[PDB]
Curated annotation (Swiss-Prot):
GO CC, alphabetical: extracellular exosome; sarcoplasm
Modified residues (Phosphoserine): S3
Stored PROSITE patterns: GLOBIN (PS01033)
Amino acids binding nitrite: H64
Main location group: cytoplasm
GO terms of molecular function: heme binding; metal ion binding; nitrite reductase activity; oxygen binding; oxygen carrier activity; peroxidase activity
Enzyme Commission number, as recorded: 1.7.-.-, 1.11.1.-
Protein name (Swiss-Prot/TrEMBL): Myoglobin
Purpose of the protein: Monomeric heme protein which primary function is to store oxygen and facilitate its diffusion within muscle tissues. Reversibly binds oxygen through a pentacoordinated heme iron and enables its timely and efficient release as needed during periods of heightened demand. Depending on the oxidative conditions of tissues and cells, and in addition to its ability to bind oxygen, it also has a nitrite reductase activity whereby it regulates the production of bioactive nitric oxide.
Modified residue annotations for Phosphothreonine: T67
Length: 153
């Protein structure tokens, strides 16, 4: 599992995320869309946006970046005991939204990238390794639920 020392690394940087959830949410979703354009097409609500400036100006996008981060934070602060939190999420993502597990890998990379951009002094190698573990645990447990439902990635 993650050790208590790894969790403390993750939650320290996350409490910095929380100082500016909306800005972090925007940078993370813009990175995802720009790096992996296919992901934008999953969003009926956002697929009209074509340029980075248009993405930055959308209030709605910033609102959904808050939704995402707020759910992610709730999961993180359970420290691996996130069975309840994860169940609704993997259900809508598998069945309603149809999000492949690979795209969850992509958003994981975009979170890590942004956290390094914004918080270098608290996001050294040790905190990066810890965060990457925590995101892998999130993926692995969601992947298990997808398997059960018959969408595995
Ligand atoms: C940290 C990773 C993610 C978290 C915590 C997350 C969380 C959420 C939450 C809580 C909602 C709203 C409730 C829902 O229907 O379950 C949501 C909706 C949605 N998510 Fe995710 N999601 C994540 C990754 C993704 C990815 C990678 C995509 C697409 C490539 C995606 C696509 C959607 C879509 C399409 C909606 C519906 C948006 C709308 O029509 O309102 N999510 N997200």
């Amino acid at each position: 599992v993650l050790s208590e020392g790894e969790w403390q690394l993750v939650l320290h940087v996350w409490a910095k995320v929380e100082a500016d959830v909306a800005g972090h949410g925007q940078d993370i979703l813009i990175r995802l869309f720009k790096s992996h354009p296919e992901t934008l097409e999953k969003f009926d609500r956002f697929k009209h946006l074509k340029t980075e400036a248009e993405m930055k100006a959308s209030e709605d996008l910033k609102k959904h970046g808050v939704t995402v981060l707020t759910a992610l934070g709730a999961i993180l602060k359970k420290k691996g005991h996130h069975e309840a939190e994860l169940k609704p999420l993997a259900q809508s993502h598998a069945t309603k939204h149809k999000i492949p597990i690979k795209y969850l890998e992509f958003i994981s990379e975009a979170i890590i990238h942004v956290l390094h951009s914004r918080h270098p002094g608290d996001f050294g190698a040790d905190a990066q390794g810890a965060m990457n573990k925590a995101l892998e645990l999130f993926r692995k447990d969601i992947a298990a639920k997808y398997k059960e439902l018959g969408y595995q990635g």
